[PDB]
Ligand binder design. Structure first.
Ligand code: MNH
Length: 152
């Protein structure tokens, strides 16, 4: 698990995200779609987005960014007692959306990059560590539900 000190750092970092959840959520998704265009194909609602300019200008992309990060914030604030919040996300991402676990690895890396991009020099070595642990716990707990389903 994460230690208390570690959960505290994660939640301190999450405070930075909450000041602009849509902005953060949009940049996360844009970072994902542009570094991994296969990921765009999982979204019929974003597949028409031919350019980064188009992605940037999509209010519906922002809205979904808000949905994504609100759900993750929910989970993070549970400090690993997150099974009730996590299991249904796991299940819809395997069964409905068909999201391989590697794509969750991609979006985890995108979150780390965006935190550095938006908080250069304000997201220290300790904070990166604690947030990376939190994101690995999230991803590992979803992996566990995927295995149960035999997904991927
Ligand atoms: C952080 C990681 C992460 C979180 C917290 C997340 C949370 C959500 C939530 C909440 C919904 C709406 C409820 C549901 O379960 O259908 C949802 C819908 C979705 N998600 Mn995801 N999702 C991903 C990663 C995430 N998703 C990744 C990675 C992929 C693609 C590569 C993805 C593709 C989807 C698709 C597709 C939908 C349905 C979008 C739509 O409304 O049309 N996403």
């Amino acid at each position: 698990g994460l230690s208390d000190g570690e959960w505290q750092q994660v939640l301190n970092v999450w405070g930075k995200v909450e000041a602009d959840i849509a902005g953060h959520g949009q940049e996360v998704l844009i970072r994902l779609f542009t570094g991994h265009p296969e990921t765009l194909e999982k979204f019929d609602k974003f597949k028409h987005l031919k350019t980064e300019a188009e992605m940037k200008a999509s209010e519906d992309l922002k809205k979904h960014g808000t949905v994504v990060l609100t759900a993750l914030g929910g989970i993070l604030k549970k400090k690993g007692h997150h099974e009730a919040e996590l299991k249904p996300l796991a299940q819809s991402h395997a069964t409905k959306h068909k999201i391989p676990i590697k794509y969750l690895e991609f979006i985890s890396d995108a979150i780390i990059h965006v935190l550095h991009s938006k908080h250069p020099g304000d997201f220290g070595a300790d904070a990166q560590g604690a947030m990376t642990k939190a994101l690995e716990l999230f991803r590992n707990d979803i992996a566990a539900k995927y295995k149960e389903l035999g997904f991927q």
